[PDB]
Amino acid sequence: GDKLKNEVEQLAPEEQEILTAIYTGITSLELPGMMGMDIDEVEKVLEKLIDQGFLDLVRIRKETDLTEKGRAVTNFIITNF
Amino acid sequence: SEMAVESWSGDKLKNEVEQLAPEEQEILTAIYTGITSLELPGMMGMDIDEVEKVLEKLIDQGFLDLVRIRKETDLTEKGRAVTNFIITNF
Amino acid sequence: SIVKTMIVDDSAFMRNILKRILSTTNKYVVIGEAANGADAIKMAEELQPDLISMDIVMPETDGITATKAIKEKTPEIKIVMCTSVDQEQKMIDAVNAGADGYIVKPFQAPKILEQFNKLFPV
Amino acid sequence: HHSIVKTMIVDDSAFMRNILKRILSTTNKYVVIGEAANGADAIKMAEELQPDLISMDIVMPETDGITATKAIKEKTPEIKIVMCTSVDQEQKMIDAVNAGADGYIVKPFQAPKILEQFNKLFPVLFQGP
Ligand code: BEF
Ligand code: BEF
Ligand SMILES: [Mg+2]
Ligand SMILES: [Mg+2]
């Protein structure tokens, strides 16, 4: 009982906003654009809130960018779309 | 720059392009346009883990790079209770 | 079907949550944002929205008074309360002020859409 | 006022239509009010739905996009039509503009470039503070 209230009090606004966002259904992915925050910073806050038990790591997802190979293939395959 | 456009001439490209599955061609076209790799499964009728398997192949196949790694996190029943406690703040 | 939507809440992050949820819809265009009651009444006269997401507890004017002021000034505007207040008396006042829906936060995104879609069906 | 742009996406590729739907969904103004898979349906749907803006592929079954662009424009010249096609031959493009096309984007395209494209035809209009 006492541990949680000290944790809730030590939970800065950013962390309160995050927790409120995931409850509503907002995936952990579009959080940065909603808070004007760097994607890397938000991910460290997520890592802070999994360790303190406020969040569970459901799935690990990768964000990717095309290689120059990729853009070349896309430029070739585009007539299929 | 434009060197890559020339380095990937038509002859070399067709071998890898014909390798690519129709779905895998769809990930690339969507990623090119700017649709994030977080955004495909809800757009391609695919489960999120299939997409992640396909992504990891296209990073192995060399068509993609790993910009950063993203966490899919849900509320614990602790965090579900915390939200209900701090809801008055909003 | 396009629903000109207005979001009224003193919590900026909460207007942000409500906008991000309405963005994935092909219906709800958030055309205005009010941070208190007073501004919500005159912005509702400005934009003539189809729908207003209305907090009650707000700095200058409560959401009940805002709803009530907007409803028999512009009754066609569907007003949905969206709030942490669950006390049934304040609920009763909201419905009697003219409110068409009532969401108790914390809410789930599909239920925000369920009130709104109930008032503007597909 | 341009705060809401009723948009109609015309492409025979369902995936490409889905591409243009993710892009326009994040915006607060572009509302996809219809989709056509062929130019013949594009002509009729624009007639019936009266969209503010049509994203128009060219290479499509039944009727092409340039023929659709032209036929929609001699009924509805007020409709803005932006060709969204992979044909990059400058002739087809001259033909599209001469048919009435107000825009022309070449696939593959980046999402901000097509919103930058669309936002020229429907800019944010300021009345003053
Ligand atoms: F800000 Be509370 F939900 F009225
Ligand atoms: F088929 Be469209 F002209 F790219
Ligand atoms: Mg409040
Ligand atoms: Mg086509």
Numbering used by the authors:
A (entry chain F): 268 to 348
B (entry chain C): 259 to 348
C (entry chain A): 3 to 124
D (entry chain B): 1 to 129
The publication says:
In archaea, the adaptor protein CheF resides at the cytoplasmic face of the archaeal C-ring formed by the proteins ArlCDE and interacts with phosphorylated CheY. In archaea, CheY-P binds to CheF, an adaptor protein uniquely present in archaeal species, however the precise mechanism of this interaction is unclear to date. Binding of CheY-P to CheF induces a rotational switch of the archaellum. CheF forms a twisted homodimer offering two CheY-P binding sites within an elongated C-terminal tail domain.
We therefore constructed a fusion protein consisting of M. maripaludis CheY and the C-terminal 103 residues of CheF separated by a 20 amino acid linker including a thrombin cleavage site. We crystallized the CheY:CheFCTD in the presence of 2 mM BeF2 and 20 mM NaF (for more details, see Materials and methods section) and could solve the structure of this activated CheY:CheFCTD to a resolution of 2.3 Å, which allowed us to model both the full CheY-P and 70 amino acids of the CheFCTD into the electron density. A CheFCTD dimer bound to two CheY-P molecules was observed in the asymmetric unit. The interaction interface between CheY-P and CheFCTD involved the three helical bundle at CheFCTD with one molecule contributing α5 and α6 and the other one α8, covering a total of 778 Å2 buried surface area. At CheY-P, the interface mainly involves the regions directly adjacent to the BeF2 binding site, namely α1 and the β3-α4-loop as well as the β4-α5-loop. Comparing CheY-P to its non-activated form revealed that structural rearrangements upon activation mainly occur in the two mentioned loop regions and thus directly adjacent to the interaction interface with CheF. At CheF, conformational changes are mostly limited to helix α8 being kinked towards CheY-P upon binding. A closer inspection of the CheY-CheFCTD interaction showed that the interaction is mostly mediated by hydrophobic residues and some polar backbone contacts “clamping” the interface on one side. Interestingly, the terminal carboxyl-moiety of MmCheF F348 reaches into the phosphorylation site contacting one of the waters coordinating the Mg2+ and MmCheY K107. We show that two CheY-P molecules bind to the dimeric CTD of CheF involving an interface near the phosphorylation site of CheY thus allowing a direct sensing of the phosphorylation state of CheY by CheF.
